[PDB]
Structure 1
């Protein structure tokens, strides 16, 4: 038993991290086969960041302007191209440590592991979720740009995030591995703000089921509710609407604990209207929303990679 915020083992991703330098900017790159993927803002100075014309900045660069370092070895750049907000550096050597991989775009509410890197060297791994407002509450300092988010499905690494920027509120924004930003963000030094965030309802419910599996049942009650009445309640507390898809997805956890999804919704309704009253759930005084229904099933079953 026990319930922790758990990240995937990072080893398959550590073997892909490289350092990319162009001029005075140094950031992280992802080396898969003979290509290094990194944020295209590596070609910008602080003067350019105000209003960059990325194609115009890129046309002035040659292959030898990009310095790529893998461990203590210098990789030779033999080509370069831009795809959305990501730069693709063709290198001479294929990464012998390239794992089985896919590039996947995730949806808000989905979780992933972040391997925080500085100078192409991994320093930490943590778990987080794509918020409904498309930001992530990460932990990144200067030099972390190019750090990646991923999930592991059997032996295949699914890369879903590449770090690009920090917003004024201390939250983070980035792209998928095809360079498409999550959220209405741009890679420029301009006024940008995170939108009003909401709580991931299906994830809080999954975490309530995890608490029941771990022996925390004080919040259970005899009541049930309807999906229409619960959504009228949830909308008042800045919770995301719960759909029939979310109810279907919580089916296995409902069968394991014997608590119907709308039965658990009535517990969440009472927790939202009354609070915890000095109590905790899984060592937390807040309702936790960064564990998906699948994360809960995985952690309470022991799936390996």
Structure 2
């Protein structure tokens, strides 16, 4: 208790959502400056989807085959190209609502806000974490493809995810805005499975730091560990190994609490090896792994 999944305000992204239709297939696109970005599978029929030859499908398309609309207002397409698994449609109008933006490729464990959209119209916004197996636990229905994930820093929207597909287990897979899938997945209506997932250690550590900030610190011990020794133990409990970048992003919380990252790792190691022994942290017997260090600082300090 005290913490909750908080999305970024979605208005700057709402002002970029359009719909893209090829034939009877409509999905969402992202309109930035004079380009619309969308999943390339908009060009597929039902039949093309098992083993689509995207290069051949696209060669048969022309600009005038793409219906791009902001609401019910058509946006004329003046060029088209494919970049990995995304289609880029050049349009004749620069989006007047284009925010300051960048395209970023996030790492597992990072969280982002999803603006779920259908027919170019936003339905809802929620926070997702990229799992270590490169899937997200979204809420996506038919027509949701092309919905995007993003973070906002100062005036700037960092787009990090575009939605493409649902796996058999009900989790979701997609690309960055350069069209490169997160994980090993491909945009084909074939049998694909996510890898066995693991716990996001860096975020559990952030959660333990949050607990300390809130005065809940019974699990702190007098010991430390090396990063390698911790990582070898963590893997035995299906926790992800830490990277150097993870150590770095815990820096601010380590400084705020005075607890060295490797000392907190030793405390987590003891929790893994001994369990909670009927105790709670921040009111729960379960350790949370979907709040990043940035999320904690956002909710603890503003």
CA distance in 2, matches of 1:21, 1:277: 56
Task: Note closer, same or farther for the CA distance 1:226–1:80 as it changes in structure 2 (3 Å cut).
Answer: closer
Moved more, 12-21 or 229-238: 229-238
Task: Note closer, same or farther for the CA distance 1:122–1:284 as it changes in structure 2 (3 Å cut).
Answer: farther
Whether the 8 Å contact between 1:2 and 1:214 is mirrored in structure 2 is: no
CA distance in 2, matches of 1:79, 1:191: 33
Alpha-carbon displacement from aligned partner over 1:255-296 (angstroms, at most 9, x marks no partner): 322323233223212322233344443344422122222222
CA distance in 1, matches of 2:284, 2:15: 35
Task: Note closer, same or farther for the CA distance 1:199–1:55 as it changes in structure 2 (3 Å cut).
Answer: same
SS for the counterpart of 1:112 is: strand
Shift of 1:107: 1.7
After TM superposition, the structure 1 = structure 2 runs for residues 108-187 of structure 1, keeping only pairs within 5 Å, are 108-187=108-187
SS for the counterpart of 1:300 is: helix
Shift of 1:31: 0.7
CA distance in 2, matches of 1:248, 1:162: 27
Whether the 8 Å contact between 1:117 and 1:144 is mirrored in structure 2 is: yes
Instruction: State the TM-score, normalized to the length of structure 1.
Output: 0.92
Whether the 8 Å contact between 1:32 and 1:94 is mirrored in structure 2 is: yes
Whether the 8 Å contact between 1:3 and 1:282 is mirrored in structure 2 is: no
Task: Note closer, same or farther for the CA distance 1:35–1:249 as it changes in structure 2 (3 Å cut).
Answer: closer
CA distance in 1, matches of 2:243, 2:32: 38
Whether the 8 Å contact between 1:22 and 1:43 is mirrored in structure 2 is: yes
Moved more, 257-266 or 6-15: 257-266
CA distance in 1, matches of 2:146, 2:108: 20
Residues matched between the structures, number:
302
Task: Note closer, same or farther for the CA distance 1:300–1:69 as it changes in structure 2 (3 Å cut).
Answer: same
Task: Note closer, same or farther for the CA distance 1:86–1:269 as it changes in structure 2 (3 Å cut).
Answer: same
Task: Note closer, same or farther for the CA distance 1:148–1:244 as it changes in structure 2 (3 Å cut).
Answer: closer
Shift of 1:5: 1.6
2:29 alignment partner in structure 1: 29
SS for the counterpart of 1:256 is: helix
Runs of 4+ in structure 1 off by over 4 angstroms are: none
SS for the counterpart of 2:301 is: coil
Shift of 1:28: 0.6
Shift of 1:138: 1.4
CA distance in 2, matches of 1:104, 1:250: 20
Task: Note closer, same or farther for the CA distance 1:67–1:194 as it changes in structure 2 (3 Å cut).
Answer: same
CA distance in 2, matches of 1:95, 1:278: 56
Task: Note closer, same or farther for the CA distance 1:228–1:93 as it changes in structure 2 (3 Å cut).
Answer: closer
Alpha-carbon displacement from aligned partner over 1:193-224 (angstroms, at most 9, x marks no partner): 10122222111101110121123223333443
Alpha-carbon displacement from aligned partner over 1:33-77 (angstroms, at most 9, x marks no partner): 111111000010111101111121112222232111212322222
Task: Note closer, same or farther for the CA distance 1:46–1:264 as it changes in structure 2 (3 Å cut).
Answer: same
Structure 2 unaligned regions, length at least 5: none
> Pairwise CA RMSD of aligned residues?
1.9
Instruction: State the TM-score, normalized to the length of structure 2.
Output: 0.93
